[PDB]
Design a protein around this ligand. Structure first.
Ligand code: 7C1
Ligand code: 7C1
Ligand code: UMP
Ligand code: UMP
Lengths: 312, 312
């Protein structure tokens, strides 16, 4: 079925993965250079073998598509998936007068006492980002995240460049261009920045009135990250095609390193006993074609029939 | 055999390629997202089914590895493969007082009279680049080519960054890094530059004391370009491993578009009747480990047994 390459990736890393000691107190099993392919005409590749929250994917992608890098927009859509790096910055500042949150991630699972403390300081941060404009400006803005790299790339000469916007124009006038490329990898930023982008680069291609995209992803958390990643980029492919008036082709997901953490193994093993169901179908607003101006309600997911989420 | 993925790529584009009208007066057949893999422990993947000049690959790569962008170095190694873009610039200048060379490529095959004229103006250019320092400076320098992108990336702040040099240091101290990335794709340059780089990005990976590299190549001329490309990047993988004291792993060549020109079909078809022979073996200077300082004689290719070149 449509999602089978995900399951085959997971099982390959499980049976043939190379073990490597990890930055964060674990190990990983990984393979290098694996590719998955998804024929978008066959359905939307949101995994049926584990519930994946399509709401969060949708609002995060709209966020990128706005060139937005401020978490306030995500909070306004009840999306907390970028909160941590924003919190991670405010906590390391002068203004922060509360309890110490050094290595707050590590201590959250281990001590159920500190967890409820951080739950509350992160509640304080969020509400304040939502209502305090000056605060949103200082701490809500992540600076160098996908929205800036895709839509406002900073040039040596003080200027800024909308790569994806330029590429979409190129798809419409030069569909057979071999240069329909959006990169998120800036050699000037990457030595110091918070996270050198995992979704390093993507490329479009058109044949027979159908739009394909290839993503090159240097590093992938197969269990937690990849299911979101597959969905965002497939969504992005549909959105770009919709705007250019084309049909959908393939999404080709190419990896550098793709890995499982030594502590996530039972979860993925249990997921592999599950049997893919028919894929859902995506529907887009027939009246809107500028995706830089799309809203949540312009995107509908039909007939999604997933197995339970796995909390792991 | 080792080179089989090349032959399978060629045959796939031949039997399943999508036809597209081309910028230059032809068409192409292409596929999107294809990958080849080469296990470098099994031999050096210089094609045996068609002679590929390893001398030119070697000197071009040494050129990149010096951070050099001036053609004089290539000329001094009797390598003419970058001449044309250099010529293409000098011909479009004030100083050029000779016969008109507009669309000199097109007219070279068609008129055997104009061909010998250009053969001589290009002989004039070369010798002058070799001996005239001021001229070499103005016309011999291509500016934004792989040596600059790999070793002298220009930063917004007027500075310059040795990405590959930094990455090699990272391989030695952090071999399990998921960020061993060298990009050649600069969104600021790409709208205006001569050729937006075809070898867009590469990534290293280490397991079990072996070094692998993945190349993402946005666009590939299967017949003429890819055989050189496979060899340069495999060579580069051996050179980096040698410097870091590691063994060689895989070279994984991932494509965006990979294509055949509608006029190169008979050539590739004839090549497909040929049967791969055992691969050659590469030998490197056991006394040199700084590849930024390697010379032609530091690299030896053993037991290369190729079928004839194909002039096509
Ligand atoms: C599943 C998911 C979904 C949306 C956004 C993100 C993720 C995710 O895993 N990261 C993320 C990125 C980087 C790092 C990291 N610095 N090691 C960790 C997590 C995200 O930003
Ligand atoms: C086989 C080969 C070997 C070395 C260097 C080059 C090639 C090649 O094909 N090009 C090259 C690059 C760009 C273009 C182009 N502008 N459409 C044409 C040829 C090179 O620079
Ligand atoms: O979209 C994403 C973003 C991140 N990750 C995971 C992969 C890595 O485990 C981690 C990044 O760590 P480094 O590779 O940068 O070290 O985040 C994903 O799977 N998908
Ligand atoms: O190392 C290289 C460099 C170039 N090409 C070919 C592929 C394309 O036919 C052409 C570049 O043209 P565009 O894709 O930029 O349009 O050069 C290669 O095969 N290998």
């Amino acid at each position: 079925m449509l999602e089978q390459p995900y399951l085959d990736l997971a099982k390959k890393v499980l049976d043939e993965g190379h073990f490597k000691p990890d930055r964060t107190h674990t190990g990983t099993y990984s393979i290098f250079g694996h590719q998955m392919r998804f024929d978008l005409s066959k359905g939307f590749p949101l995994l049926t073998t584990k519930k994946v929250p399509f709401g969060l994917i949708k609002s995060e992608l709209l966020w990128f598509l706005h060139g937005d890098t401020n978490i306030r927009f995500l909070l306004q859509h009840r999306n907390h998936i970028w909160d941590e790096w924003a919190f991670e910055k405010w906590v390391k500042s002068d203004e922060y007068h509360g309890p110490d949150m050094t290595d707050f991630g590590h201590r959250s699972q281990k001590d159920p006492e500190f967890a409820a403390v951080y739950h509350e300081e992160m509640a304080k941060f969020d509400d304040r980002v939502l209502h305090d404009d000056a605060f949103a400006a200082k701490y809500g803005d992540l600076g160098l995240v996908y929205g800036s790299q895709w839509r406002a790339w900073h040039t040596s000469k003080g200027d800024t460049i909308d790569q994806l916007g330029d590429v979409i124009e190129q798809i419409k006038t030069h569909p057979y261009s071999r240069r329909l490329i959006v990169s998120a990898w800036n050699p000037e930023d990457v030595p110091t920045m918070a996270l050198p982008p995992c979704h390093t680069l993507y490329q479009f291609y058109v044949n027979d009135g159908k739009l394909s995209l290839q993503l090159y992803q240097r590093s992938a958390d197969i269990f937690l990250g990849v299911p979101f990643n597959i969905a965002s980029y497939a969504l992005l492919t549909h959105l770009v095609a919709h705007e250019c008036g084309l049909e959908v082709g393939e999404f080709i997901h190419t990896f550098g390193d793709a890995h499982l953490y030594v502590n996530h193994l039972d979860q993925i093993k249990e997921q592999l006993s599950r049997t893919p169901r028919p894929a859902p179908t995506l529907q887009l607003n027939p009246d809107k074609h500028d995706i830089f101006d799309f809203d949540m309600k312009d995107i509908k997911l039909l007939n999604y029939d997933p197995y339970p989420a796995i909390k792991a």
